[PDB]
Protein backbone atom coordinates (compact mmCIF):
# COMPACT_ATOMS: atom_id res chain seq x y z
CA UNK A 1 0.00 0.00 0.00
CA UNK A 2 1.14 3.46 -0.71
CA UNK A 3 2.96 5.15 1.91
CA UNK A 4 1.18 7.47 4.82
CA UNK A 5 2.65 10.77 6.32
CA UNK A 6 1.89 10.37 10.23
CA UNK A 7 2.40 13.55 12.45
CA UNK A 8 3.26 12.95 16.36
CA UNK A 9 4.51 15.52 18.39
CA UNK A 10 4.91 16.46 22.23
CA UNK A 11 7.85 17.34 24.78
CA UNK A 12 9.89 14.27 25.12
CA UNK A 13 11.75 15.05 28.07
CA UNK A 14 13.51 11.92 29.85
CA UNK A 15 12.55 10.09 27.15
CA UNK A 16 11.14 6.91 29.08
CA UNK A 17 9.09 3.14 27.27
CA UNK A 18 5.72 5.58 27.58
CA UNK A 19 6.69 7.68 24.82
CA UNK A 20 8.70 5.15 23.11
CA UNK A 21 4.90 2.57 22.70
CA UNK A 22 3.28 5.57 21.31
CA UNK A 23 5.72 6.43 18.84
CA UNK A 24 5.54 3.25 17.89
CA UNK A 25 2.12 2.96 17.51
CA UNK A 26 2.14 6.18 15.37
CA UNK A 27 4.36 4.61 13.24
CA UNK A 28 2.24 1.56 12.92
CA UNK A 29 -1.49 3.24 12.61
CA UNK A 30 -0.95 2.12 8.51
CA UNK A 31 1.36 -0.44 6.86
CA UNK A 32 3.55 1.97 4.70
CA UNK A 33 4.28 5.28 7.27
CA UNK A 34 6.77 7.67 7.56
CA UNK A 35 6.54 8.68 11.25
CA UNK A 36 7.70 12.74 11.58
CA UNK A 37 7.84 13.64 15.18
CA UNK A 38 7.50 17.66 16.54
CA UNK A 39 9.36 18.00 19.82
CA UNK A 40 8.46 21.15 21.21
CA UNK A 41 10.50 24.19 22.10
CA UNK A 42 11.60 24.80 25.51
CA UNK A 43 10.35 28.77 25.94
CA UNK A 44 6.65 27.78 24.91
CA UNK A 45 6.78 23.74 27.09
CA UNK A 46 7.57 26.34 29.99
CA UNK A 47 5.30 28.61 29.61
CA UNK A 48 1.96 26.89 28.14
CA UNK A 49 2.61 23.56 29.76
CA UNK A 50 5.11 22.97 32.48
CA UNK A 51 8.57 22.18 33.93
CA UNK A 52 11.13 20.62 31.40
CA UNK A 53 15.06 19.48 32.35
CA UNK A 54 16.39 18.51 29.12
CA UNK A 55 17.09 21.23 26.19
CA UNK A 56 15.14 20.93 22.81
CA UNK A 57 18.53 19.87 21.57
CA UNK A 58 18.79 17.21 24.49
CA UNK A 59 15.20 15.92 23.72
CA UNK A 60 15.87 16.06 20.12
CA UNK A 61 19.17 14.06 19.72
CA UNK A 62 17.98 11.33 22.10
CA UNK A 63 15.01 11.03 20.26
CA UNK A 64 16.84 10.46 16.77
CA UNK A 65 17.93 7.15 18.12
CA UNK A 66 14.37 5.66 18.47
CA UNK A 67 13.97 3.21 15.76
CA UNK A 68 9.93 4.70 14.74
CA UNK A 69 11.22 7.75 14.23
CA UNK A 70 11.72 8.62 10.83
CA UNK A 71 11.94 12.53 10.56
CA UNK A 72 11.85 15.13 13.68
CA UNK A 73 11.35 18.69 13.50
CA UNK A 74 12.62 20.51 15.79
CA UNK A 75 11.64 22.89 17.51
CA UNK A 76 7.67 22.26 16.12
CA UNK A 77 5.02 24.80 16.28
CA UNK A 78 3.01 24.71 19.79
CA UNK A 79 -0.14 24.78 17.92
CA UNK A 80 -0.80 22.33 15.11
CA UNK A 81 -2.24 24.29 11.71
CA UNK A 82 -3.65 22.99 8.50
CA UNK A 83 -1.72 25.09 6.72
CA UNK A 84 1.34 22.77 8.92
CA UNK A 85 0.15 19.69 7.51
CA UNK A 86 -0.21 21.34 3.84
CA UNK A 87 3.53 22.34 4.15
CA UNK A 88 4.71 18.91 5.28
CA UNK A 89 2.94 16.74 3.42
CA UNK A 90 0.81 15.08 6.70
CA UNK A 91 -1.91 12.96 6.26
CA UNK A 92 -2.71 12.17 9.94
CA UNK A 93 -1.93 13.66 13.23
CA UNK A 94 -1.67 10.80 16.27
CA UNK A 95 -2.65 12.61 19.04
CA UNK A 96 -3.82 11.20 22.41
CA UNK A 97 -12.43 20.63 21.82
CA UNK A 98 -9.31 22.80 19.90
CA UNK A 99 -8.56 19.54 17.57
CA UNK A 100 -12.41 19.58 16.01
CA UNK A 101 -10.41 20.87 13.07
CA UNK A 102 -8.67 17.87 12.82
CA UNK A 103 -11.08 15.52 13.32
CA UNK A 104 -13.24 17.19 10.83
CA UNK A 105 -10.61 16.67 8.30
CA UNK A 106 -10.41 13.15 8.90
CA UNK A 107 -6.98 13.74 10.17
CA UNK A 108 -6.89 12.97 13.90
CA UNK A 109 -5.97 9.05 15.36
CA UNK A 110 -5.72 8.39 18.67
CA UNK A 111 -3.03 7.17 20.31
CA UNK A 112 -2.65 5.93 23.68
CA UNK A 113 -0.12 6.91 26.87
CA UNK A 114 0.91 4.22 29.09
CA UNK A 115 0.46 5.14 33.01
CA UNK A 116 3.62 3.98 35.52
CA UNK A 117 6.61 3.82 32.97
CA UNK A 118 8.07 7.14 33.34
CA UNK A 119 11.30 8.27 33.87
CA UNK A 120 10.09 9.66 37.13
CA UNK A 121 8.37 6.62 38.23
CA UNK A 122 11.90 5.03 38.11
CA UNK A 123 13.16 7.65 40.58
CA UNK A 124 10.52 7.21 42.55
CA UNK A 125 10.92 2.87 42.78
CA UNK A 126 14.98 4.02 43.87
CA UNK A 127 13.36 6.21 47.01
CA UNK A 128 10.89 3.51 47.80
CA UNK A 129 14.36 1.64 49.26
CA UNK A 130 13.99 4.05 51.94
CA UNK A 131 11.72 3.70 54.51
CA UNK A 132 10.34 6.15 56.06
CA UNK A 133 11.23 4.72 59.64
CA UNK B 1 30.83 -5.42 2.27
CA UNK B 2 29.73 -8.62 3.99
CA UNK B 3 28.05 -8.97 6.77
CA UNK B 4 29.84 -8.22 10.64
CA UNK B 5 28.23 -9.71 13.62
CA UNK B 6 28.52 -7.36 16.50
CA UNK B 7 28.11 -7.90 20.02
CA UNK B 8 27.88 -5.27 22.82
CA UNK B 9 26.56 -6.35 26.65
CA UNK B 10 25.44 -3.95 29.67
CA UNK B 11 22.60 -3.51 32.41
CA UNK B 12 21.09 -0.68 30.17
CA UNK B 13 19.70 0.42 33.28
CA UNK B 14 17.44 3.50 32.83
CA UNK B 15 18.56 3.68 29.41
CA UNK B 16 20.04 7.20 28.65
CA UNK B 17 21.71 8.78 25.64
CA UNK B 18 25.24 7.43 26.50
CA UNK B 19 23.86 4.11 26.31
CA UNK B 20 22.35 4.83 23.08
CA UNK B 21 25.57 6.53 21.52
CA UNK B 22 27.48 3.47 22.71
CA UNK B 23 25.44 1.58 20.79
CA UNK B 24 25.04 3.79 17.75
CA UNK B 25 29.39 3.50 17.93
CA UNK B 26 29.03 -0.94 17.90
CA UNK B 27 26.88 -1.17 15.27
CA UNK B 28 29.03 1.07 12.85
CA UNK B 29 32.38 -0.75 13.82
CA UNK B 30 31.38 -1.71 10.07
CA UNK B 31 29.78 -0.60 7.03
CA UNK B 32 27.40 -3.65 7.28
CA UNK B 33 26.82 -5.09 10.47
CA UNK B 34 24.17 -7.35 13.11
CA UNK B 35 24.19 -5.74 16.13
CA UNK B 36 23.53 -8.07 19.08
CA UNK B 37 23.34 -6.54 22.50
CA UNK B 38 23.69 -8.59 25.70
CA UNK B 39 20.75 -7.58 28.64
CA UNK B 40 22.62 -8.70 32.08
CA UNK B 41 20.65 -10.82 34.29
CA UNK B 42 18.80 -8.80 37.80
CA UNK B 43 20.40 -11.69 40.14
CA UNK B 44 24.25 -11.64 38.52
CA UNK B 45 24.22 -7.76 38.22
CA UNK B 46 23.46 -6.84 41.80
CA UNK B 47 25.67 -9.68 43.33
CA UNK B 48 28.36 -8.65 41.03
CA UNK B 49 28.15 -4.87 40.02
CA UNK B 50 25.62 -3.18 41.93
CA UNK B 51 22.08 -1.88 42.91
CA UNK B 52 19.17 -1.79 39.08
CA UNK B 53 15.92 -0.54 39.21
CA UNK B 54 14.29 -1.89 36.67
CA UNK B 55 13.75 -5.72 35.98
CA UNK B 56 15.31 -7.48 33.42
CA UNK B 57 12.16 -7.54 31.31
CA UNK B 58 11.79 -3.41 31.47
CA UNK B 59 15.38 -3.13 30.49
CA UNK B 60 15.09 -4.81 27.99
CA UNK B 61 12.10 -4.12 26.58
CA UNK B 62 13.02 -0.53 26.38
CA UNK B 63 16.18 -1.17 24.27
CA UNK B 64 14.30 -3.20 21.78
CA UNK B 65 12.85 0.68 20.78
CA UNK B 66 16.21 1.70 20.19
CA UNK B 67 16.95 1.52 15.95
CA UNK B 68 20.73 0.31 16.20
CA UNK B 69 19.37 -2.93 18.27
CA UNK B 70 19.51 -5.83 15.96
CA UNK B 71 18.96 -8.74 18.42
CA UNK B 72 18.91 -8.73 21.63
CA UNK B 73 19.92 -11.73 24.03
CA UNK B 74 18.66 -11.73 27.29
CA UNK B 75 19.68 -12.19 30.16
CA UNK B 76 22.88 -12.53 28.30
CA UNK B 77 25.88 -14.56 30.58
CA UNK B 78 27.30 -12.26 32.79
CA UNK B 79 30.71 -13.44 31.47
CA UNK B 80 31.55 -13.36 27.50
CA UNK B 81 33.43 -17.03 26.82
CA UNK B 82 34.74 -18.06 23.13
CA UNK B 83 32.44 -20.82 23.10
CA UNK B 84 29.12 -17.99 22.95
CA UNK B 85 31.12 -16.13 20.43
CA UNK B 86 31.02 -19.25 18.28
CA UNK B 87 27.32 -20.19 19.55
CA UNK B 88 25.67 -16.81 18.13
CA UNK B 89 28.61 -16.70 15.22
CA UNK B 90 29.81 -13.21 16.41
CA UNK B 91 32.89 -11.64 14.82
CA UNK B 92 33.59 -8.11 17.09
CA UNK B 93 32.93 -7.72 20.40
CA UNK B 94 32.38 -3.70 21.59
CA UNK B 95 33.55 -3.02 24.76
CA UNK B 96 34.43 -0.07 26.74
CA UNK B 97 43.28 -8.31 32.10
CA UNK B 98 39.50 -10.62 32.21
CA UNK B 99 39.83 -9.72 28.05
CA UNK B 100 42.63 -10.26 27.34
CA UNK B 101 42.05 -13.19 25.38
CA UNK B 102 39.58 -11.19 23.22
CA UNK B 103 42.09 -9.06 22.25
CA UNK B 104 44.42 -11.85 21.41
CA UNK B 105 41.56 -13.14 19.20
CA UNK B 106 41.07 -9.85 17.29
CA UNK B 107 37.70 -9.45 18.49
CA UNK B 108 37.91 -6.51 20.72
CA UNK B 109 36.58 -3.43 19.42
CA UNK B 110 36.35 -0.67 21.79
CA UNK B 111 33.98 2.17 22.61
CA UNK B 112 33.60 4.89 24.24
CA UNK B 113 31.20 5.91 27.28
CA UNK B 114 29.77 9.49 27.60
CA UNK B 115 29.82 11.45 30.80
CA UNK B 116 27.45 13.28 31.95
CA UNK B 117 23.96 12.51 30.35
CA UNK B 118 22.82 9.41 32.33
CA UNK B 119 19.55 9.63 33.85
CA UNK B 120 20.51 10.33 37.51
CA UNK B 121 22.33 13.00 35.87
CA UNK B 122 18.69 14.26 34.59
CA UNK B 123 17.93 14.20 38.29
CA UNK B 124 20.36 16.24 39.59
CA UNK B 125 19.58 18.36 37.58
CA UNK B 126 15.91 18.66 38.77
CA UNK B 127 17.34 18.88 42.38
CA UNK B 128 19.29 21.85 41.49
CA UNK B 129 16.01 23.78 40.99
CA UNK B 130 15.95 23.56 45.26
CA UNK B 131 18.68 25.96 47.05
CA UNK B 132 20.26 24.80 50.03
CA UNK B 133 18.83 27.77 51.87
Not at 25 to 47: M, R, Y
Not at 76 to 82: E, H, N, R, Y
Not at 119 to 128: E, H, M, N
Request: glycine fraction near 4%; proline fraction near 2%.
Amino acid sequence: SKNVVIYADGVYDMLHLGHMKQLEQAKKLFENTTLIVGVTSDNETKLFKGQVVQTLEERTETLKHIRWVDEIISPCPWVVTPEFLEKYKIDYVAHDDIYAWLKRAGKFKATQRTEGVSTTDLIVRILKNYEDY
